[PDB]
Design a protein around this ligand. Structure first.
Ligand SMILES: NC(=O)c1c[se]c([C@@H]2O[C@H](COP(=O)(O)OP(=O)(O)OC[C@H]3O[C@@H](n4cnc5c(N)ncnc54)[C@H](O)[C@@H]3O)[C@@H](O)[C@H]2O)n1
Ligand SMILES: NC(=O)c1c[se]c([C@@H]2O[C@H](COP(=O)(O)OP(=O)(O)OC[C@H]3O[C@@H](n4cnc5c(N)ncnc54)[C@H](O)[C@@H]3O)[C@@H](O)[C@H]2O)n1
Ligand SMILES: NC(=O)c1c[se]c([C@@H]2O[C@H](COP(=O)(O)OP(=O)(O)OC[C@H]3O[C@@H](n4cnc5c(N)ncnc54)[C@H](O)[C@@H]3O)[C@@H](O)[C@H]2O)n1
Ligand SMILES: NC(=O)c1c[se]c([C@@H]2O[C@H](COP(=O)(O)OP(=O)(O)OC[C@H]3O[C@@H](n4cnc5c(N)ncnc54)[C@H](O)[C@@H]3O)[C@@H](O)[C@H]2O)n1
Ligand SMILES: O=P(O)(O)OC[C@H]1O[C@@H](n2cnc3c(Cl)[nH+]cnc32)[C@H](O)[C@@H]1O
Ligand SMILES: O=P(O)(O)OC[C@H]1O[C@@H](n2cnc3c(Cl)[nH+]cnc32)[C@H](O)[C@@H]1O
Ligand SMILES: O=P(O)(O)OC[C@H]1O[C@@H](n2cnc3c(Cl)[nH+]cnc32)[C@H](O)[C@@H]1O
Ligand SMILES: O=P(O)(O)OC[C@H]1O[C@@H](n2cnc3c(Cl)[nH+]cnc32)[C@H](O)[C@@H]1O
Lengths: 304, 304, 304, 304
């Protein structure tokens, strides 16, 4: 005998089905473990040409990221984006403060990476110029809705006035929006609006974006390691966290400890999560769910 | 490449599908922004021949509307209906108290608009006569269920004994009910009963009513700007608010401030909401959802 | 034009559809009002040969029914069943205490009706004999699950040793169970177990039972007038209430007032509910939902 | 007439349907009672060659099972597994402490049964050797995810170095995982991970495992007698309880009383539950749901 029929759903049937799901609406069926967790490689792609030893990224929120944070984040394997809710002069001053840890994220010159947010209005161009000076590695046009002529133009701009600077498009949740931002020439995409339901939004935008070599950043909703694993598993290349970090020490302010103990923790969990599903890298988990090897299963409200 | 398949649901498939939805059961997928929010025109139709610079309307509730309120409402772009839970003499006295702000809603003689509720019994005819005198612009046969012979007759009555006065039909939730009220000759419709689930009720009654040129007032359930935008987007021409206003200053009684700061706020949000979905007027948003350009997506309970 | 397509669901499609619904899982679409509420006739059938001027019935619970209650209930239009959680001698003593109000429920000799619960074991036969003496009108074999050989036999028994006494079968939720109890010869049925979901249970058991002329008592879950109206509308001939009454004065013990003010209230609401849906009697409401004139609509969890 | 159509769902349609259900997502339709509860035989199979007079099994949790508990459990009809969160020397010392009650679970030599958990790493082999000495009856490779090469090998090991010792495989939730553990040669299976949703997990793994004569232990989620009955009814041969017992007296620590009063209680309820559905043994309940005689019905979130 020994034939075993066939597990649950395939990412496709589940996230193209008038569903509209969250991270908590489904679980993932385990696989075959035949190696240890510490062998799981979490290397991820932040933008077409920026790569991290971990998929973690902090949010451009005054209550979250600022030099202090941006630094730890990079030392430990991630990267941070400074909030533009301050004087342009104050922001670029943060960017420069930032500019053993085998994982440390560094530029082509041994320096910790740093990114920062900027609006899509005129006055922002100046801010940009200060930021570019302080040696910023990447910029993220920070908007709740990004499929606008005001972002498309700010993109075509920066893409020209600064060819070696990587640009990340404003928040989108459909492939109809992503198209435009990818034509204007963005180097990555920030997915999230309402935290459309997140999981379904990530699934959809990644599925289109990969066809062009554009990474996707799962932005919003991450509450625990689980959500992170589910967000990567659906297509996201990296994950952005806001509130889940606002209680660390490196956070600007008056729970948890330093980013130097928390981040390691997260990385541990995530590899452990990649073991349970029998994948050795994150790249492999994405390949599995697109092929149909990785199976899922919905949970009822009362089943949560 | 660059083809992008096709977004979520179309208002139709979603609100004719044994669903029975609320404002919180679904979200709307964003569109293409290529203009500023302050360019969004919120002009709406209260009744076949009454038109406002904003879709806002206050409720005929003693805890909400009375002269003071009715006035602000009109100065700012809306309109109010005085509650008939008082002596006929007291009600019409409110109507007369009422009878820069470029938006100010005015009659053909520079006077702020005013409306008021009245029952469908005999004794109400008198009340009417006092109200008509004080110069009331519109009357709304105020009932929990309006598809009755007692309203059909009160309609045919008022429609005759007062040809220049606009009549709004009592609360309905189906197109089977709306038919009768539209034949008796109402000039508009008040949709809501149980706050059937509201969103599905608005969708349905508007879809039928538009075929006759009869506006629909989304009555009940509005808790925040979002619900307002969703209610208009489904077909409603205007929106009536009760409790969301009962905490303003212009409200009769012993949170929030004056209607002169709140209303502006609401108008701001609503245009902003119309931007996110790429529509320039409310008229355009309705045209988009009826055509199938505007897309939606359901959220699970646990996805809320 | 004026054609109006077609309202929601038909009781059938909705309660034979792997649903498993509660009273709160759905609402009923309004109809055409063309008469006043006080014209609604609430006459209902308790058992094949017992008939009440209202569908109300109190529960055989020590915390609810006992002589005092049983009396009010009948004076006002209902009927009560005394709890058998006491000495047989004490129970029959209650039955005898019981043995203007135009609605008053009376026997063929001007006496208030009274019913009472009894087990299905040997010792219960004696209890019965005392009860029959005190002039009890009806008996209800009181069990959580009634499709047993121990009830079938207690039925065939009582049906013989007392031909003029009406017997009500123990709690069932399927038509598979009802069959047996109806063959043993019961004169009515008590539906409810888990308060299977109630609404679906009532629907199902009534649909089968009517084919034999056996009334059904919706037992359990009634929290407000609404549930009562929905329970009758689904097929139930009468409704049994436990906790909703335990806070009246006529209740045995140390909220609400007397049954003489509460019951009237309930009757008022129920007629009002029968108006909203355009039915003049309860008999008519049942006829409407079986024909397909009466329409329903499900509500999502988040739509409740 | 008297034909009665056909009850609800069949375990199959319901637990192979992209559902993902919990114990609370459904109920079971009653059957035909024609015998007393105390006639219900709860004999169950713990492992291919271990059999208990009741399906109860305590959890390998320091907050739950340890000698004291393990003993009561066996005296009353169940069995316990000592937690390996202690020195190997301390664990085997518990096993030996353990090594009228007609139900008492005993070895071939009049001694109370005892089982215990052990990891799947090298160092665990030693622990094993101490445990085997103290006369342990069964071992349960204790892991959150069991489909690993590290468990498959620890199985093939123990199966050889100790032929008369019964081995239970680490936690699984699919038949894809169960296959491997059954080939390595386990004598039973522990189902549960996330407490995939439990009910659906039990259903699935039992359905495959029975084809090989391998019992399944429903592990996790049991909160009351009901869940226990539903877990057995779906295919499980026995049920493991953690927290529901942590408040007994026999539990290690500083609610409820002794296991000698609680367990009886549970057994009583469970037979009563087997009566309501007309089954005389647990073996019969499983046979009924696999044949399609036993019917179920889903409940909406708002129907819970
Ligand atoms: N990530 C998210 O989804 C999210 C949610 Se709230 C949030 C944060 O909240 C902020 C506010 O959201 P907004 O939609 O206001 O975003 P943004 O700050 O981009 O402002 C959008 C408004 O700015 C206008 N605008 C931009 N450039 C313009 C120009 N050159 N000329 C004329 N009008 C122009 C837009 O048309 C629009 O109404 C965002 O900047 C971001 O920092 N992000
Ligand atoms: N908008 C809503 O959905 C809603 C919910 Se409660 C609510 C407010 O609550 C009030 C009460 O709801 P009701 O259903 O009682 O509404 P209404 O005040 O219209 O009264 C309805 C009752 O009045 C009777 N009636 C009306 N005219 C009659 C006449 N000429 N002869 C004989 N009977 C007549 C109806 O037949 C019915 O039973 C409403 O008037 C309204 O102010 N509105
Ligand atoms: N209405 C309801 O659904 C409901 C829920 Se609880 C509830 C009340 O709780 C009480 C307990 O529920 P039960 O299932 O125990 O109901 P009941 O009091 O009918 O007792 C049932 C038990 O009594 C046994 N029994 C009855 N007659 C017997 C006889 N002559 N010989 C041998 N065994 C016999 C049954 O086989 C069964 O295990 C009910 O009597 C009722 O008063 N009613
Ligand atoms: N029953 C359950 O579902 C459940 C949930 Se939490 C839980 C308890 O929590 C504990 C922890 O869960 P874990 O997944 O850590 O389970 P376990 O204690 O089996 O440890 C698993 C980790 O140990 C590693 N491992 C095992 N043998 C190894 C070997 N010989 N060489 C190299 N690596 C090896 C695995 O590859 C894996 O990453 C379990 O042991 C159990 O006691 N059980
Ligand atoms: O990770 P959490 O805290 O859920 O949310 C992170 C995302 O929240 C969004 N956000 C931040 N402040 C906001 C104010 N209002 C609404 N959304 C906001 C951003 O897109 C940010 O990256
Ligand atoms: O806007 P909210 O406060 O949800 O509700 C407004 C609507 O509530 C209804 N309403 C007012 N008082 C009521 C008393 N009982 C039930 N419904 C009421 C009216 O139709 C009113 O316009
Ligand atoms: O009307 P409520 O209070 O919901 O419940 C009434 C029904 O509850 C049931 N009931 C009473 N006591 C019970 C104890 N345990 C479980 N069910 C009970 C009976 O069937 C009774 O007629
Ligand atoms: O019976 P309850 O208390 O729900 O859970 C019992 C099961 O819980 C699991 N478990 C115990 N401690 C755990 C720590 N973390 C997660 N799962 C655990 C085990 O599989 C155990 O047999």
């Amino acid at each position: 005998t020994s034939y075993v029929p066939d597990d649950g759903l395939t990412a496709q049937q589940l996230f193209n089905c008038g569903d509209g799901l969250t991270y908590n609406d489904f679980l993932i069926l385990p696989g075959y473990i035949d190696f240890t967790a510490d062998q799981v490689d979490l290397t991820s792609a932040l933008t077409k040409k920026i790569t991290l030893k971990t998929p973690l990224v902090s949010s451009p929120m005054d209550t979250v990221t600022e030099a202090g944070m941006a630094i730890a984040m990079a030392l430990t394997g991630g990267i941070g984006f400074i909030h533009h809710n301050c004087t342009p002069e104050f922001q670029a001053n943060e960017v420069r403060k930032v500019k053993d840890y085998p994982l440390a994220s560094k530029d082509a010159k041994k320096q910790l990476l740093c990114g920062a947010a900027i609006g899509t209005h005129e006055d922002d161009k100046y801010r940009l110029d200060l930021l570019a000076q302080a040696g910023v590695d990447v910029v993220v046009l920070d908007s709740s809705q990004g499929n606008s002529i005001f972002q498309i133009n700010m993109i075509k701009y920066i893409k020209d006035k600064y060819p070696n600077l990587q640009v990340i498009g404003g928040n989108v949740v459909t492939a109809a929006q992503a198209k435009n931002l990818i034509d204007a020439g963005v180097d990555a995409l920030r997915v999230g609006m309402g935290s459309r339901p997140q999981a379904t939004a990530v699934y959809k935008v990644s599925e289109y974006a990969r066809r062009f070599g554009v990474p996707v950043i799962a932005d919003g909703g991450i509450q625990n390691v689980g959500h992170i694993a589910k967000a990567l598993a659906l297509g996201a290349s990296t994950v952005m966290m806001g509130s889940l970090l606002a209680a660390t020490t490196e956070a600007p302010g008056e729970d948890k400890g330093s980013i130097h103990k928390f981040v390691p923790y997260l990385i541990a969990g995530i590899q452990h999560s990649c073991q349970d599903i029998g994948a050795k890298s994150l790249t492999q988990v994405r390949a599995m769910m697109y092929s149909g090897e990785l199976k899922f299963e919905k949970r009822t409200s009362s089943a949560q």
